[PDB]
Amino acid sequence: KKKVIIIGAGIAGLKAASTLHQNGIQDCLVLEARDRVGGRLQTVTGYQGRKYDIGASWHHDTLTNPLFLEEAQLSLNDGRTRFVFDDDNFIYIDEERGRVDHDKELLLEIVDNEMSKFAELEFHQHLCSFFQLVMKYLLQRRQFLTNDQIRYLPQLCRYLELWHGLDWKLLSAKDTYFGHQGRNAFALNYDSVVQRIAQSFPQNWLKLSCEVKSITREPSKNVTVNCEDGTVYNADYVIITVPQSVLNLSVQPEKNLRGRIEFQPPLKPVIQDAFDKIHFGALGKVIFEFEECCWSNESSKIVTLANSTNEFVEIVRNAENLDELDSMLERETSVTCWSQPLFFVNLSKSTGVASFMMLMQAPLTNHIESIREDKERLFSFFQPVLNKIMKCLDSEDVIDGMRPIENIANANKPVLRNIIVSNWTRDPYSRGAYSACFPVDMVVAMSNGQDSRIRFAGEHTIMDGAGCAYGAWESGRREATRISDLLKLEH
Amino acid sequence: PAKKKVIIIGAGIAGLKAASTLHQNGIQDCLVLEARDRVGGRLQTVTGYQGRKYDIGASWHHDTLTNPLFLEEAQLSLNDGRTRFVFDDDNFIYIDEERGRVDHDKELLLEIVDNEMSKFAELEFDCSFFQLVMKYLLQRRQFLTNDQIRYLPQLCRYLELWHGLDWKLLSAKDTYFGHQGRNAFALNYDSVVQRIAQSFPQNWLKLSCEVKSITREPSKNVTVNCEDGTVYNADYVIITVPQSVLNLSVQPEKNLRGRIEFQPPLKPVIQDAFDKIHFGALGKVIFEFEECCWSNESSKIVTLANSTNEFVEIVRNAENLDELDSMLSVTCWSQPLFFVNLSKSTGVASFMMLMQAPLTNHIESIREDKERLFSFFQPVLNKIMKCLDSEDVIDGMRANKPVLRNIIVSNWTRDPYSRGAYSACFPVDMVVAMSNGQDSRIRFAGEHTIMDGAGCAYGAWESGRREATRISDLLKLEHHH
Ligand SMILES: Cc1cc2nc3c(=O)[nH]c(=O)nc-3n(C[C@H](O)[C@H](O)[C@H](O)COP(=O)(O)OP(=O)(O)OC[C@H]3O[C@@H](n4cnc5c(N)ncnc54)[C@H](O)[C@@H]3O)c2cc1C
Ligand SMILES: Cc1cc2nc3c(=O)[nH]c(=O)nc-3n(C[C@H](O)[C@H](O)[C@H](O)COP(=O)(O)OP(=O)(O)OC[C@H]3O[C@@H](n4cnc5c(N)ncnc54)[C@H](O)[C@@H]3O)c2cc1C
């Protein structure tokens, strides 16, 4: 009855639909499990109506990003603002020492650059965790590092944890260091991107609250699709764009799992084997909304470093080898806001909004999202880093005003009015893990499809832009174009 | 003629390491012939005001993560606690004559777009560095502010001091590249030279012998003649004279200083390689002051050449590259200049400045006119002192003010034994031709004969080790049964 059935209304599924329509293909459907489109692209509303992209927020690799270039062309043609280049000189804060960035003595950024080079050479032509790689660097280069560099550098370099959404002891060293193709551009409305694409094809194509539970290849070469609500569909081709984490459920037994799709026949071994990798990270976000800005806007990029110790330095100095270094690194807790690095975006400088957008990594992410409803507890957890940031930004301790009390004595003090938290690790339609946005087994299997009728798209199905919004976007255009060409050739 | 096992021509670091390696491998009766009355070649440490020392040739150990020469020096320091170098990389201070400092500027963010420029170059790869920058500007104009477009190109040119060549003459394809780790400022490259020179029989060195001819004999030996008439015969010869001096061999005129007459002549593959390589010239000027009375915030300072708001206008209006090029007296502000503030890194009240061609050739030609040198650089020197919370410089070459006591200038473009061809230190035709040699007996070493570390002191060092080892491997066969 239908030419193509797209499962998932994320950017991958939406672009696919936009492409099909663009190429004159009719009678298509987009089945989405949620009651909204966008998927991992979701803009939420907070205090005084302020908006924030709780999912994707930046356009990466702007020198080659096709989606960004499309957005840029639009703004060049209508002068409307669709993004802002917010890269900045990072401000690094240690709880005890305060700012350690661009330090005339520490020169941490310079040694971090050496660390990245060290990583590049370590895996050159290679066919270890991030933590171990850093320890290797310190042992090898200690003769050329001051005491404070050995102490702070490892905590600074961990900003990469926020790129991968994963702790350094769990992140693989080989996939940690990589370069981005140009500046990043903060999207001033990824929802505006979702909207434009979503409205580029006929409305009746969209079917929300349609949780696909099964996909079958009929003997008549037709593909049947059934949603939880009982509805049944069939088409010439199907483009599956559900997240890798959801698709992974298909290999497990019991169709019970929310989101899990029953494949008949099952996904071929090439696909199944591909899941034996990835699915560990989890990027989370916490938005702190203040009444107004009363802090320095020197930079829109701030990172708080986890606590470090001088004993750590003594150990690195005394260790005779890696094994002895590990052994010595055994002291004698409870996780606090200073137990890991945290990345804060000072939206005041970049967008003029008196709010901070903070990124966190697994294992913290899961823990914080699990208490996302307990605002008082959230404030207590982050209060110490929030106050240190304010102190370093020429301001003062944050006033908890989530339960407001108009008081003129707060005039020039930061008053927190609301906290917003992501929920991706607890969302059954996203669940699984997170991967950084990069400019192989899974990519090959996915881009290869189940067969000539069952295709796949999404951020986990492409090389260029892997784990990126533009990658998912491009992967959608890819599958749609492949099918439109085929349909056009039929006659 | 005296018989020798191996004769090395040139006592720069390549020749010295070759000799060092030959001795290490037990090879006897060798000789090192050097035209100058000193060893070291392009590694020369001079003395100035109050006995202060400066490397007027190579100064840094580059690519310290893998540099074998540096690693050897580091091991020595680790064992005797003696200081041989200092990691002096720093946050660069950028200065514009009118605007003053423009580094780490919360609004200009020049360092960030410079990084994008670099990535642009990477993804791009042949034209000139200048043209590549112009292309970047046209492609990214929509995402660059007016002041970014004005100053970025001038900041990008710090790379001119890496290659010692103006951006319009510099190959864009060879402009951008990354070093393997931080740099280490040698605290006496002369100490490196002395160590290596003392590592083989002292009777092997013969200074003041300008070699004028090398002849491959039918008996398979090689005859080497010094201009003073002395003759030597050897089984193998390792030639380490600079590429520019070797180039003389293919030109007619035997009276040319340093020129070696080869018989038979250099192979066509070698002769022809002299067509696509070299063009720049890295120069140095040392400014010695009585004492430090300025800010030691950083040891790295770069003065940007003058720019204009008209340039920005042109960039915005240009319809394309063709329309851009159409729409588009030397002073210290006509090109970028790189200054090393030694007070912070070494504690010495002096500035070591690097310059590029064509300026280098002009300045070295007038290095004897100190007053003229002072007047030429006085404006950048003053702007620097101002930005470092100081005052104008007082000429004291003959309290809270900087007093210039002396100026020292390099001489590589005028030195007949170097002839400033200069190339940047990087971690193909000439290399292959050189590494393959003239024949089994006539070999070559030097910074221009190796891929890894090409143009670097450690590259020259390694090339010497390579030729000495090859010869040792061959001589090894003489003891087989
Ligand atoms: C916290 C976070 C921050 C990020 N920040 C950035 C950033 O700054 N820049 C960037 O480029 N990228 C970023 N990303 C990545 C980017 O958001 C994703 O690459 C992109 O949105 C993935 O799009 P997609 O279409 O492949 O998948 P999705 O957007 O996940 O869409 C797939 C759709 O499938 C639906 N679905 C699932 N199961 C079923 C089912 N059984 N039946 C029907 N429908 C189903 C889902 O509900 C969903 O709408 C971020 C990701 C996260 C989690
Ligand atoms: C201004 C400047 C700055 C530099 N800075 C750095 C730096 O910071 N880091 C770095 O790694 N590298 C640097 N270099 C490069 C480095 O100095 C060279 O790579 C290295 O010294 C070259 O060594 P070589 O042995 O190949 O040649 P040379 O050192 O030139 O030695 C060859 C020798 O041959 C002799 N000779 C020539 N003709 C004859 C003849 N006919 N008979 C006998 N002897 C002859 C010469 O007098 C000379 O001593 C710099 C170079 C210059 C010019």
Side-chain angles (χ1 to χ4, degrees), chain A residues 1-173 175-188 190-206 208-490, chain B residues 1-187 189-308 310-328 330-481:
Chain A
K1 64 180 178 182
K2 303 297 177 178
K3 285 297 182 178
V4 188
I5 288 179
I6 299 167
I7 298 189
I11 194 160
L14 298 171
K15 210 303 185 287
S18 178
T19 301
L20 288 171
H21 179 61
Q22 171 190 300
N23 297 324
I25 307 301
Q26 303 191 64
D27 306 308
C28 293
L29 293 173
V30 177
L31 307 182
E32 168 58 39
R34 294 194 177 88
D35 58 31
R36 67 173 180 80
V37 299
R40 277 168 284 177
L41 286 188
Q42 174 179 38
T43 309
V44 297
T45 304
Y47 186 60
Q48 303 179 328
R50 298 172 188 180
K51 298 180 63 181
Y52 313 92
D53 275 309
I54 203 65
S57 198
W58 287 277
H59 281 293
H60 294 302
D61 309 312
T62 60
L63 285 178
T64 58
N65 180 167
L67 177 54
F68 169 75
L69 294 177
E70 179 167 289
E71 290 284 303
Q73 259 302 311
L74 295 178
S75 293
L76 180 61
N77 290 310
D78 57 50
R80 299 190 63 186
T81 298
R82 292 183 171 67
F83 49 71
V84 60
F85 280 73
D86 68 331
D87 284 319
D88 212 322
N89 301 309
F90 276 64
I91 291 182
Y92 288 103
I93 302 173
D94 170 78
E95 178 181 18
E96 184 171 64
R97 184 157 177 163
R99 290 181 67 172
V100 298
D101 55 281
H102 202 68
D103 190 283
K104 66 183 295 185
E105 285 182 54
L106 300 173
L107 297 175
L108 301 181
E109 293 87 349
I110 297 177
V111 289
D112 178 56
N113 179 66
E114 186 173 85
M115 243 294 276
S116 67
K117 269 297 179 180
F118 175 77
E120 186 190 306
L121 301 178
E122 278 291 298
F123 295 98
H124 181 56
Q125 300 178 299
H126 180 290
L127 299 176
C128 181
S129 71
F130 174 33
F131 169 65
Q132 291 172 294
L133 184 69
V134 177
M135 296 307 98
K136 299 183 192 300
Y137 171 77
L138 297 176
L139 258 182
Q140 182 177 307
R141 304 291 280 180
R142 61 186 174 181
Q143 187 188 339
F144 322 118
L145 297 168
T146 62
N147 290 331
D148 285 337
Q149 295 180 322
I150 293 176
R151 179 180 178 174
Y152 300 115
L153 170 61
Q155 299 316 323
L156 178 150
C157 78
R158 286 175 74 188
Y159 60 70
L160 285 180
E161 294 195 346
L162 293 318
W163 282 36
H164 300 275
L166 185 60
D167 181 82
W168 67 338
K169 293 186 175 182
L170 305 175
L171 178 63
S172 65
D175 303 300
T176 300
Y177 289 89
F178 67 78
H180 270 304
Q181 306 185 71
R183 285 174 296 169
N184 297 293
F186 194 77
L188 286 181
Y190 244 122
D191 62 321
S192 293
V193 173
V194 172
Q195 294 165 50
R196 178 170 63 74
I197 303 178
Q199 303 184 307
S200 67
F201 60 82
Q203 293 178 57
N204 57 62
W205 279 22
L206 185 60
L208 296 176
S209 295
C210 206
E211 183 184 318
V212 173
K213 61 179 178 180
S214 63
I215 290 179
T216 307
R217 324 178 207 178
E218 303 180 307
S220 52
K221 296 185 178 181
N222 299 301
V223 183
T224 293
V225 185
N226 312 305
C227 289
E228 206 67 299
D229 68 298
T231 51
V232 179
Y233 309 77
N234 79 302
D236 300 354
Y237 299 81
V238 64
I239 301 175
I240 302 165
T241 74
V242 308
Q244 189 187 312
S245 59
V246 171
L247 193 61
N248 202 315
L249 296 178
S250 290
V251 304
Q252 301 172 59
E254 299 185 303
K255 310 178 182 180
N256 176 301
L257 305 170
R258 176 75 58 184
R260 167 194 163 68
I261 298 176
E262 178 66 47
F263 288 88
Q264 200 56 58
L267 300 171
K268 46 188 176 181
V270 61
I271 309 301
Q272 298 179 295
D273 302 308
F275 296 86
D276 292 59
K277 301 177 180 180
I278 302 182
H279 296 304
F280 299 73
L283 190 67
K285 292 188 179 186
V286 177
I287 308 303
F288 300 92
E289 301 187 282
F290 300 84
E291 300 197 317
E292 53 183 298
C293 175
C294 53
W295 59 79
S296 168
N297 279 325
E298 182 185 323
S299 176
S300 69
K301 299 293 167 293
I302 304 163
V303 167
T304 50
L305 293 57
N307 290 340
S308 54
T309 65
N310 278 330
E311 165 168 44
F312 173 74
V313 182
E314 187 62 26
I315 289 172
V316 172
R317 291 293 189 201
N318 295 168
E320 281 191 51
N321 62 288
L322 295 179
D323 287 310
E324 176 168 291
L325 184 59
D326 297 303
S327 176
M328 297 182 88
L329 292 177
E330 295 178 59
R331 80 162 192 179
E332 304 178 301
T333 301
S334 77
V335 174
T336 72
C337 57
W338 290 113
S339 300
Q340 64 289 295
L342 295 173
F343 170 58
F344 298 75
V345 177
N346 174 194
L347 297 169
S348 185
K349 178 181 184 182
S350 61
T351 69
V353 181
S355 299
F356 283 169
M357 175 184 274
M358 184 204 82
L359 280 53
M360 54 183 170
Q361 71 287 261
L364 221 213
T365 292
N366 308 269
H367 297 161
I368 292 300
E369 295 192 338
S370 78
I371 66 167
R372 67 192 300 277
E373 292 293 313
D374 198 332
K375 305 302 187 64
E376 307 190 320
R377 187 176 186 174
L378 293 173
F379 177 68
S380 298
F381 186 81
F382 294 107
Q383 177 176 44
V385 284
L386 289 176
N387 289 337
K388 191 69 190 190
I389 288 173
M390 293 301 166
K391 181 180 181 61
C392 290
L393 293 185
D394 304 313
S395 190
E396 62 183 75
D397 288 5
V398 177
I399 298 172
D400 177 358
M402 300 188 285
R403 293 182 308 190
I405 289 295
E406 166 163 35
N407 188 323
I408 58 180
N410 304 313
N412 301 300
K413 303 181 185 179
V415 183
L416 183 67
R417 292 296 293 255
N418 186 230
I419 295 177
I420 304 173
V421 187
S422 52
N423 194 218
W424 305 112
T425 66
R426 302 169 67 200
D427 185 328
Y429 299 141
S430 64
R431 57 171 74 197
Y434 162 84
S435 290
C437 157
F438 304 78
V440 182
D441 296 304
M442 181 59 74
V443 177
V444 179
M446 289 289 99
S447 63
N448 233 304
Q450 180 71 312
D451 58 49
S452 63
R453 306 289 194 175
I454 316 300
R455 317 301 297 182
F456 300 82
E459 57 145 43
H460 59 300
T461 70
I462 191 168
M463 182 178 283
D464 194 305
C468 316
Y470 74 85
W473 178 86
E474 176 63 48
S475 67
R477 182 168 69 175
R478 179 193 71 202
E479 296 308 312
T481 300
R482 162 174 177 290
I483 295 176
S484 61
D485 286 338
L486 290 177
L487 285 170
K488 289 175 176 297
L489 292 179
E490 290 191 0
Chain B
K3 293 277 292 184
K4 299 292 175 179
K5 206 63 182 172
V6 186
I7 291 175
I8 295 159
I9 299 74
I13 194 170
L16 292 177
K17 179 59 183 183
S20 179
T21 298
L22 285 172
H23 181 243
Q24 178 176 180
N25 299 343
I27 308 302
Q28 296 169 44
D29 309 310
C30 292
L31 183 67
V32 178
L33 304 176
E34 167 61 52
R36 304 167 183 285
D37 64 356
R38 69 176 176 78
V39 292
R42 282 171 279 177
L43 292 189
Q44 167 175 42
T45 305
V46 298
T47 295
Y49 185 66
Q50 302 183 307
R52 300 180 188 181
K53 305 173 185 179
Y54 314 87
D55 274 309
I56 199 65
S59 282
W60 288 274
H61 281 292
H62 298 298
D63 307 314
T64 56
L65 282 177
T66 57
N67 182 337
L69 173 56
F70 168 73
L71 292 172
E72 192 169 278
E73 287 290 298
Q75 183 62 209
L76 288 171
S77 285
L78 182 61
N79 290 321
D80 62 6
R82 298 179 61 188
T83 301
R84 292 179 171 68
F85 51 73
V86 56
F87 281 73
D88 69 326
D89 284 312
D90 212 321
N91 297 308
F92 275 61
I93 284 184
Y94 289 103
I95 302 175
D96 175 70
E97 173 178 31
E98 308 297 57
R99 185 154 181 169
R101 293 183 62 173
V102 293
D103 57 285
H104 200 246
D105 186 287
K106 70 178 186 178
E107 177 175 300
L108 298 174
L109 301 174
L110 302 181
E111 292 79 352
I112 295 180
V113 284
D114 175 54
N115 178 70
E116 185 176 79
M117 229 310 305
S118 299
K119 179 58 63 176
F120 174 76
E122 186 188 306
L123 301 178
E124 194 71 354
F125 301 100
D126 301 312
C127 64
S128 76
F129 179 23
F130 166 72
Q131 278 156 45
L132 183 64
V133 175
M134 292 304 105
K135 182 174 186 176
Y136 168 77
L137 293 179
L138 275 175
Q139 185 183 303
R140 303 292 282 182
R141 63 213 291 184
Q142 197 193 323
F143 323 111
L144 293 167
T145 66
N146 271 27
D147 288 339
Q148 288 183 319
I149 292 178
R150 173 176 176 180
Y151 302 99
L152 178 54
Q154 297 315 315
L155 185 154
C156 285
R157 301 176 66 182
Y158 59 70
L159 288 179
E160 296 194 344
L161 296 315
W162 283 39
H163 299 277
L165 176 61
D166 181 82
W167 66 336
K168 291 182 175 181
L169 305 177
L170 179 63
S171 170
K173 187 173 184 180
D174 305 299
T175 299
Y176 291 83
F177 68 85
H179 278 298
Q180 303 181 305
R182 290 174 291 160
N183 302 288
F185 192 78
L187 288 177
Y189 241 122
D190 68 323
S191 67
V192 181
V193 167
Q194 300 317 314
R195 173 172 72 80
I196 299 173
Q198 304 182 317
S199 67
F200 56 82
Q202 297 308 85
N203 59 298
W204 283 9
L205 184 62
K206 182 182 181 182
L207 301 177
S208 301
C209 149
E210 179 175 309
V211 170
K212 62 166 185 173
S213 67
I214 294 181
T215 302
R216 178 56 188 296
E217 297 303 320
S219 65
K220 299 186 176 180
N221 280 299
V222 184
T223 299
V224 188
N225 282 268
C226 293
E227 62 166 43
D228 77 340
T230 58
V231 185
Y232 303 90
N233 182 63
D235 293 310
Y236 295 87
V237 299
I238 300 174
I239 303 152
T240 73
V241 306
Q243 185 183 311
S244 56
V245 177
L246 190 60
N247 199 328
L248 302 178
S249 285
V250 309
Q251 299 166 49
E253 170 79 66
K254 304 173 185 174
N255 201 337
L256 290 176
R257 197 76 293 91
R259 178 181 178 287
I260 297 171
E261 178 69 39
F262 284 94
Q263 286 305 321
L266 298 173
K267 305 187 304 182
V269 294
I270 289 175
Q271 289 188 51
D272 298 337
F274 288 105
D275 295 305
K276 289 188 179 183
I277 27 185
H278 297 316
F279 195 54
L282 192 65
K284 276 191 176 53
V285 180
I286 308 300
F287 298 94
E288 301 185 279
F289 298 86
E290 185 56 53
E291 76 186 312
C292 174
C293 65
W294 56 82
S295 170
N296 283 322
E297 183 186 318
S298 175
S299 63
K300 300 291 173 291
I301 301 164
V302 170
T303 56
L304 306 180
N306 291 332
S307 48
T308 68
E310 284 74 11
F311 173 70
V312 179
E313 293 172 54
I314 298 172
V315 183
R316 298 293 190 189
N317 307 318
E319 180 177 60
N320 65 297
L321 288 175
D322 296 300
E323 182 176 298
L324 179 59
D325 291 300
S326 64
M327 294 176 78
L328 296 177
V330 181
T331 68
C332 52
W333 293 108
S334 296
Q335 64 290 292
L337 295 173
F338 172 54
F339 301 71
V340 173
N341 170 207
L342 298 169
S343 182
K344 183 184 178 176
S345 57
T346 70
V348 180
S350 306
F351 283 1
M352 176 190 270
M353 182 202 92
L354 277 51
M355 52 182 171
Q356 71 288 260
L359 184 65
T360 297
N361 305 71
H362 178 289
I363 297 297
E364 293 200 340
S365 75
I366 70 172
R367 67 176 206 137
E368 240 42 60
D369 193 334
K370 301 304 176 69
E371 294 169 61
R372 181 174 180 178
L373 293 175
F374 177 72
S375 296
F376 180 89
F377 296 103
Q378 180 175 48
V380 286
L381 294 180
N382 285 341
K383 192 65 186 184
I384 291 179
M385 291 310 279
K386 184 175 185 179
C387 293
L388 298 189
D389 308 315
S390 187
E391 306 173 298
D392 292 338
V393 178
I394 293 176
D395 186 322
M397 298 187 285
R398 295 188 179 183
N400 299 299
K401 304 179 183 179
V403 180
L404 181 58
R405 294 300 194 186
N406 184 220
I407 295 180
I408 304 178
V409 187
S410 55
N411 193 236
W412 310 115
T413 63
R414 297 169 69 190
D415 186 339
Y417 298 128
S418 69
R419 300 167 182 276
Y422 191 78
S423 293
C425 158
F426 308 88
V428 181
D429 290 359
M430 179 60 83
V431 173
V432 178
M434 288 284 93
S435 59
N436 284 339
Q438 169 60 9
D439 66 26
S440 70
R441 311 285 201 173
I442 306 174
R443 318 298 297 182
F444 302 94
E447 58 147 45
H448 57 296
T449 73
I450 196 164
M451 188 180 290
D452 295 316
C456 320
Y458 76 88
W461 181 86
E462 184 71 57
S463 70
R465 178 165 72 176
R466 175 194 69 201
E467 294 308 316
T469 302
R470 168 178 170 290
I471 289 176
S472 298
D473 293 344
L474 292 168
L475 295 178
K476 198 75 61 66
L477 313 183
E478 282 177 19
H479 300 304
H480 289 358
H481 293 303

